């Protein structure tokens, strides 16, 4: 009877940490997808900003020559 309680308790303890872990893991997995999308989005914008400021570097240069 006592052995049953010991194991029965372990079941409640195992079930508790399982549903809690899976619950947060699922939430985390879904969050990663959102963060990953944001990473891809920000990276894309950074690429557009990088190629733009570079275009100004060659633009400000040619204008400096014409001014001289």
């Amino acid at each position: 009877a006592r052995k049953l309680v010991i194991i029965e308790s372990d079941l409640e303890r195992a079930e508790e940490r399982a549903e809690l872990s899976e619950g947060k893991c699922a939430e985390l997995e879904e969050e990663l997808k959102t963060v990953t999308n944001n990473l891809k989005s920000l990276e894309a914008q950074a690429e557009k900003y990088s190629q733009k400021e570079d275009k100004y570097e060659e633009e400000i240069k040619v204008l400096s020559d014409k001014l001289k």
Binding site: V5, S9, E12, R13
Partner: protein
């Protein structure tokens, strides 16, 4: 065994006394703390009554014993009886003289200064004890694992103690003393049983409650859901045919009394559940001390063997408290003797000399010698 004085090991409480031989690991003789009179007249000549009856002698035959409780949290109604209670332990069973071996005792935190001296007076003056000491309950349960950073909660029949002793002891208040353990649980059940008619009146059957309690009674996980379960007669109605002769179906009575632990409102006090007092001892200390406290919480005391005592802690602690570290409570399986395990150590330590009291040391600094120097 023979060579070297060899010191004994003891741990007296306000309900159950723990004492054995010397150099042992666990208590060898655990007699109950009871001493009453024969309100009745003993047969008066079928022995000159006296002996209020004690030890396995009294517990075996309560019937005709008006069990008189001498030690009630702090105040000892009478010391005269305690003298003949200790005259039984060392001799009748251990068969060894204290006028030969040292002695170790436990200290109930925040106990009147006059008491620690009254006891020592009995030893030094009469039982001639050149060497002894009185250590602090919880701290002993500590030094017996493998780390110097854990919070301890030690209690049994005396009073509850929330002692966050890990790296050191005593700073602002942190520690707590609550008169609500063992004897308090035995006293509360009889009051609540009166609702069903059952009324264990005298103090003799009062003990039977405690005996029956530690066999089936358990703690409510959630009183709300368990109340609706009462409709069924399987998990509730429990069988326990009185050794006398009358079954007591302790169904909703088992998980009713323990609720008082989490709800001290049922015993006329403002004290919150044991999970609030946990915060009360954590919020006081530094900020960068918490993350590791949750990772280690020592729970000592045989009182913490009630089914449904540990699993509840994880539910209430994780609620109103920081939740990004490892919440972990160390509840030693046999946590009742955790103090006894640590006791056998102090009695064998050599550094102990730096702490203990010598015969002459008691006369030089007077009676206060003990708690006037140590803590």
């Amino acid at each position: 065994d023979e060579d070297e004085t060899t010191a004994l090991v003891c741990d007296n409480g306000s309900g159950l006394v723990k004492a054995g031989f010397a150099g042992d690991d666990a208590p060898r003789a655990v007699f109950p703390s009871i001493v009453g009179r024969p309100r009745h007249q003993g047969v008066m000549v079928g022995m000159g009554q006296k002996d209020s009856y004690v030890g396995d002698e009294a517990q075996s035959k309560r019937g005709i014993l008006t069990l008189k409780y001498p030690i009630e949290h702090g105040i000892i109604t009478n010391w005269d009886d305690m003298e003949k209670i200790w005259h039984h332990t060392f001799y009748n069973e251990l068969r060894v003289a204290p006028e030969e071996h040292p002695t170790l005792l436990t200290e109930a935190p925040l106990n009147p200064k006059a008491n620690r001296e009254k006891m020592t007076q009995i030893m030094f003056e009469t039982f001639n004890v050149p060497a002894m000491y009185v250590a602090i309950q919880a701290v002993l349960s500590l030094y017996a694992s493998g780390r110097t950073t854990g919070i301890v909660l030690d209690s049994g029949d005396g009073v509850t103690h929330n002692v966050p002793i890990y790296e050191g002891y005593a700073l602002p208040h942190a520690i707590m003393r609550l008169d609500l353990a063992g004897r308090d649980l035995t006293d509360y059940l009889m009051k609540i049983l009166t609702e069903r008619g059952y009324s264990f009146v005298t103090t003799a059957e009062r003990e039977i409650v405690r005996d029956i309690k530690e066999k089936l009674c358990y703690v409510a996980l959630d009183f709300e859901n368990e109340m609706a379960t009462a409709a069924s007669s399987s998990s509730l109605e429990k069988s326990y045919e009185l050794p006398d002769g009358q079954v007591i179906t302790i169904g909703n009575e088992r998980f009713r009394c323990p609720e008082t632990l989490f709800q001290p409102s049922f015993i006329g006090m403002e004290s919150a559940g044991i999970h609030e007092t946990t915060y009360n001892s954590i919020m006081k200390c530094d900020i960068d001390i918490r993350k590791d406290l949750y990772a280690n919480n020592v729970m000592s005391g045989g009182t913490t063997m009630y089914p449904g005592i540990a699993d509840r802690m994880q539910k209430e602690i994780t609620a109103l408290a920081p939740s990004t570290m490892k919440i972990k409570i160390i509840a030693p399986p046999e946590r009742k003797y955790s103090v006894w395990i640590g006791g056998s150590i102090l009695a064998s330590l050599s550094t102990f000399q730096q702490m203990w009291i010598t015969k002459q040391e008691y006369d030089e600094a007077g009676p206060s010698i003990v708690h006037r120097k140590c803590f």
